[PDB]
Amino acid sequence: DLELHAPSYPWSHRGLLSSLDHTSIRRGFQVYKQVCSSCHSMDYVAYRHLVGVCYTEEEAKALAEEVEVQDGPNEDGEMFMRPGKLSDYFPKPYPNPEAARAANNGALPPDLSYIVRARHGGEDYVFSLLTGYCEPPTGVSLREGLYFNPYFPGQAIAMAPPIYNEVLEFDDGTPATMSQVAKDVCTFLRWASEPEHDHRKRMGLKMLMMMGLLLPLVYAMKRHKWSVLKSRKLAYRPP
Amino acid sequence: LSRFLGPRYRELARNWIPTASMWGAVGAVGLVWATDWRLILDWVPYINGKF
Amino acid sequence: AFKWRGKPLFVRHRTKKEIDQEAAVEVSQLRDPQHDLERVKKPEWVILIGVCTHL
Amino acid sequence: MTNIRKSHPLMKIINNAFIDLPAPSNISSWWNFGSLLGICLILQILTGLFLAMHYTSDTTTAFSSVTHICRDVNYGWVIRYLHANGASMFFICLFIHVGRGLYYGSYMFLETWNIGVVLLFTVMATAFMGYVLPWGQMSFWGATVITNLLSAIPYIGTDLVEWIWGGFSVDKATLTRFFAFHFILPFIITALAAVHLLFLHETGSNNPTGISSDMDKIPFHPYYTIKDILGALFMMLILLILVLFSPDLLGDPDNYTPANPLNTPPHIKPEWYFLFAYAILRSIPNKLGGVLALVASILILILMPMLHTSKQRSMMFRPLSQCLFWMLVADLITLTWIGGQPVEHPFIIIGQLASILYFLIILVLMPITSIIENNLLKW
Amino acid sequence: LVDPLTTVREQCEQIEKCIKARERLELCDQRVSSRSQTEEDCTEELFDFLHARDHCVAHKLFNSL
Amino acid sequence: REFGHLTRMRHVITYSLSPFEQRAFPHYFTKGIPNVLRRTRACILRVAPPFVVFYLVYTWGTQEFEKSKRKNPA
Amino acid sequence: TLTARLYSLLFRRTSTFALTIAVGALFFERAFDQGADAIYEHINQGKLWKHIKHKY
Amino acid sequence: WLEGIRKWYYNAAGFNKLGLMRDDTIYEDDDVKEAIRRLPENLYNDRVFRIKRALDLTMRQQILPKEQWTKYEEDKFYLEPYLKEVIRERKEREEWAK
Numbered sequence A: 001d002l003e004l005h006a007p008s009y010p011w012s013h014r015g016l017l018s019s020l021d022h023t024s025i026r027r028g029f030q031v032y033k034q035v036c037s038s039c040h041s042m043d044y045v046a047y048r049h050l051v052g053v054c055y056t057e058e059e060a061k062a063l064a065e066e067v068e069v070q071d072g073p074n075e076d077g078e079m080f081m082r083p084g085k086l087s088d089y090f091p092k093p094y095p096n097p098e099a100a101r102a103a104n105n106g107a108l109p110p111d112l113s114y115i116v117r118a119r120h121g122g123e124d125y126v127f128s129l130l131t132g133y134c135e136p137p138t139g140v141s142l143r144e145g146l147y148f149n150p151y152f153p154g155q156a157i158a159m160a161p162p163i164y165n166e167v168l169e170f171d172d173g174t175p176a177t178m179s180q181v182a183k184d185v186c187t188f189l190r191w192a193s194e195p196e197h198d199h200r201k202r203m204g205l206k207m208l209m210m211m212g213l214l215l216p217l218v219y220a221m222k223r224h225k226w227s228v229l230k231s232r233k234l235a236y237r238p239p
Numbered sequence B: 001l002s003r004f005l006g007p008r009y010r011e012l013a014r015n016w017i018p019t020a021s022m023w024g025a026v027g028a029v030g031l032v033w034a035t036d037w038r039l040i041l042d043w044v045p046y047i048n049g050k051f
Numbered sequence C: 001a002f003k004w005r006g007k008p009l010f011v012r013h014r015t016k017k018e019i020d021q022e023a024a025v026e027v028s029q030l031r032d033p034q035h036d037l038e039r040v041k042k043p044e045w046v047i048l049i050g051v052c053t054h055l
Numbered sequence D: 001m002t003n004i005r006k007s008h009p010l011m012k013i014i015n016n017a018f019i020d021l022p023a024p025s026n027i028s029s030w031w032n033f034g035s036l037l038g039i040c041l042i043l044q045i046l047t048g049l050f051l052a053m054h055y056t057s058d059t060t061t062a063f064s065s066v067t068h069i070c071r072d073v074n075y076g077w078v079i080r081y082l083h084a085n086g087a088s089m090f091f092i093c094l095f096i097h098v099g100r101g102l103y104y105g106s107y108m109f110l111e112t113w114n115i116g117v118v119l120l121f122t123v124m125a126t127a128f129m130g131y132v133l134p135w136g137q138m139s140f141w142g143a144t145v146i147t148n149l150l151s152a153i154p155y156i157g158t159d160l161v162e163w164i165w166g167g168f169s170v171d172k173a174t175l176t177r178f179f180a181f182h183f184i185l186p187f188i189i190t191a192l193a194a195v196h197l198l199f200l201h202e203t204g205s206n207n208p209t210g211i212s213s214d215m216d217k218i219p220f221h222p223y224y225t226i227k228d229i230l231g232a233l234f235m236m237l238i239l240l241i242l243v244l245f246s247p248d249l250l251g252d253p254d255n256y257t258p259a260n261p262l263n264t265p266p267h268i269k270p271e272w273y274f275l276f277a278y279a280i281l282r283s284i285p286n287k288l289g290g291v292l293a294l295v296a297s298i299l300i301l302i303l304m305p306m307l308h309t310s311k312q313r314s315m316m317f318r319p320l321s322q323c324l325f326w327m328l329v330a331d332l333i334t335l336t337w338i339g340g341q342p343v344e345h346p347f348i349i350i351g352q353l354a355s356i357l358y359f360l361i362i363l364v365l366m367p368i369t370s371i372i373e374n375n376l377l378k379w
Numbered sequence E: 001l002v003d004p005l006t007t008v009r010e011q012c013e014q015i016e017k018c019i020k021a022r023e024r025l026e027l028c029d030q031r032v033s034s035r036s037q038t039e040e041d042c043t044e045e046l047f048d049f050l051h052a053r054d055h056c057v058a059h060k061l062f063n064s065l
Numbered sequence F: 001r002e003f004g005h006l007t008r009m010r011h012v013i014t015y016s017l018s019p020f021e022q023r024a025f026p027h028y029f030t031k032g033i034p035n036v037l038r039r040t041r042a043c044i045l046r047v048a049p050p051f052v053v054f055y056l057v058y059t060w061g062t063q064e065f066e067k068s069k070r071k072n073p074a
Numbered sequence G: 001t002l003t004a005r006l007y008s009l010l011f012r013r014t015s016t017f018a019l020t021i022a023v024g025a026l027f028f029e030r031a032f033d034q035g036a037d038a039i040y041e042h043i044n045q046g047k048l049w050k051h052i053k054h055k056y
Numbered sequence H: 001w002l003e004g005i006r007k008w009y010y011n012a013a014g015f016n017k018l019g020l021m022r023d024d025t026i027y028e029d030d031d032v033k034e035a036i037r038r039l040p041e042n043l044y045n046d047r048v049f050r051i052k053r054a055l056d057l058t059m060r061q062q063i064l065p066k067e068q069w070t071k072y073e074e075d076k077f078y079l080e081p082y083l084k085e086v087i088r089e090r091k092e093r094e095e096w097a098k
């Protein structure tokens, strides 16, 4: 049995009032575009969500225009191709869910729209699982087509090793070392699970200041009104 | 509690047993009729034809 | 297999070889405390649901 | 000719229920929870409605609709996580309220106590049906397990279970009826809370000392309005911290996975506020016995006014009873933790001992200890 | 290209906890290898080593990235 | 239950002062800290022991799970 | 005293109290929003979209 | 001796720290209000003032100074003779009822 919990990595957003490094979000979206989207799928987020987070409006519409998307009925009821728009969700690599299993060994690639928020451990898991591949220890033979990963429950993943150094070229020009790719794609997946992360932290800062202001004042009001009773002095004078 | 029981309470119980038993029979008949309890309804003569 | 209740129905006719092999299989060695005839009441007709346990 | 506050009928009821109500002068902070629950209730309703306006109770779209709420609805995520963590806060305040009632001998109010027990049961039912709505893996499988629980009842059994299921198992129909029952129930809770307050007002309130406070009553409005407002501000502080800093602190991550009936999640646990019952479930080997123990764990609160034997209403002047009560609380946290953990050798025996102790303290240790204290104090 | 992750692994495998986990690991290795028909797997000591190494690695690494 | 027929008192005098004449925090720390310390001293010997034994039980069970979980040399 | 002048210039009348509260909230919303946003941007300098729009 | 344990429990209960006496803390069951009603005027006034002072103290979470604590030997069971009579009358009514 046994499972290895992921170590608590020092993420940039780990801080109580920290925000996702949006440059790393852009790089992680690049990684998803040219690595994970080939077999893995992401649905609940769309190109529209990219604007104001990691890509500008022009860049986002270019990214949407690059891909080809199936549309509704034609003038006679055909399935005509169409250049994707900003209001298009990220294309699914395999049309039917079973086709994903058929193309792979049989395990379908889970959707990443919540994989950070659905896997117990968070990014530390999703990061480490990518940078945790190693040769199986002696005495445990793995099936043909399977791969050994200590962090994955069961220690038998169906992934070909997805992230290796010099797999893609970041637009910025940062080194494409496997750790950098894994970190940036993990940050992007965290953004995918929690788009409102930065706004949540901002509102949390506002809430903390507002309550640190209000609570002393409301306590002072309570003390003011109750001071009639907290200072009363009784007296008993029976005859 | 032990404050009950004694002379007066036992004849109260005896007096109210017939009515309580009739109410229990009322509840039983109402239950078997309401849910159409088969187990009993394959025995009463004329209603056997319902099923 | 057919496809009932959102699950396949892995059904095999369990040829004599398969049933004798199952009878030869020790109950204790199996993790599930179950015996072949005790689960399926037909030696030549095994009726099993689709999917797989443990995901 | 007369003040409207105590002449207008609705104004008269509001006046003699919230403004001029004579309340004990020394009610501690624990009493504030009585207000907070009600506020939580409103916060549960008012927020909950705003989820119902973008939630479709359909298997094909429930999870997708919730994700749409959290990702596309303007400030929808605030509403969703405010609702979830507010339900958690509701159960926290409910447990603290029951603890206050048990401690300071409040169960002599009988009618209010029984109405409170009914409210408690209704709230647990509401939360159970609520967890199913997102239609996640944990939602689906917890619903499956809890409904399959009812198969243990004799005779009717499977027929009742399938009646609840609206079919052979949980499916679209079950989701829809859960959503409808979930919508209706909190208004019944509101009416029952009104009845609870109505019953409570006839006798007043139990002060911490437990003695009658008719010689120290104070008007409600000048003091307890602001006291309960401070309490509600503190509760808002805690709830908002939970929502805006660790939204999924008290929540299984696997609920963020669309419900796939073909895969059992490695762990199947209910919400954090049900584990104490579920652990009792795990304790009893017999299924029927397990369900009976599960319901009796909550039903035992009715027996409390009959099981109190000490000649002192409160527990403020009763040390050994205080130690017993705190042992009971620790046992409750132990049961919660055990229910959280899976069922193996280290935990099975601990669960059995915890369940036995939980029943024993309420039914045996507390009354006998009260007898001992009465004897020790020359009465 | 030299991956900083590999260098972090190298310098972080020196921590004496890693040293004991590793030597226990070969103490599993030769035992399992020599014993022909044995169901024991060294995944246990491997997981101990992986935990001990990766806590340290998580402490480091991100500074270089 | 409304004011007027609550109870009966005789020879009881209550002196009180306006909230606008007193300080809402009169010796907040000078007298508050000793009172809190006294209350904690009075309550801790009854409230702490069940929670500390709960902590011991929790730690013991959590450690018990692993060694039953751990590999058995055989 | 400044406090006494503030009271018996702008606090005695409850309607003047309400007007004071309204204008105070009007200004306080802007002040608090500006301050909190500035602080939050300062903590995460270089990590927000508004700090990298110039590059792209 | 048992009196040592009784003293220990009296000190541990803490109602003496509030200036209260034993009969000042008894839960008011149906017999208790009747017993209280039969109390003479002076005892009733002292009882009501003592309870009022106890409530005053508990509102501020404070206790009487060490000097003004009802010592265990000075505690008086003023209600006990009346409560015994009320309970005896209730028992007699119950016995006649059965």
Ligand code: HEC
Pocket: A031, A032, A035, A036, A038, A039, A040, A104, A105, A107, A108, A109, A110, A115, A119, A126, A152, A153, A156, A157, A158, A159, A160, A162, A163, A185
């Ligand atoms: C590229 C940047 C990535 C990332 C971040 C992930 N993948 Fe894959 N994946 C593949 C298959 C067949 C599976 C199923 C194996 C199984 O779960 O049993 C997966 C699974 C995942 C997970 C789930 C792990 C878990 O804890 O359940 C995650 C988080 C994940 N992946 C992330 C297949 C491929 C593949 C080609 C066949 C490529 C390329 C990728 N994956 C790439 C990525």
Ligand code: HEM
Pocket: D041, D044, D045, D046, D047, D048, D049, D050, D051, D052, D055, D066, D080, D083, D084, D087, D090, D123, D126, D127, D130, D131, D132, D133, D134, D182, D183, D186, D189
């Ligand atoms: C008694 C108070 C209530 C409790 C305890 C409660 C509990 C819950 C819980 C635990 C959830 C699951 C939240 C999640 O997993 O994300 C939920 C969801 C929901 N509740 Fe309630 N609820 C209450 C009142 C209401 C009311 C009054 C309504 C209707 C107005 C409502 C409508 C909903 C809806 C639509 C959802 C699904 C939204 C979602 O996915 O979170 N609830 N409820």
Ligand code: HEM
Pocket: D030, D031, D032, D033, D034, D035, D037, D038, D041, D094, D097, D098, D101, D106, D107, D109, D112, D113, D114, D115, D116, D117, D119, D120, D123, D189, D193, D196, D197, D200, D204, D205, D206, D207, D301
């Ligand atoms: C739906 C949740 C509930 C709400 C909204 C609610 C509401 C209230 C309110 C406002 C009070 C007065 C404040 C107070 O005394 O604390 C109160 C008192 C009381 N409630 Fe509840 N209650 C709820 C649940 C319960 C439960 C579960 C019980 C126990 C079974 C219960 C039993 C009591 C008792 C005994 C009192 C009297 C306490 C006293 O005044 O001394 N209530 N309730």
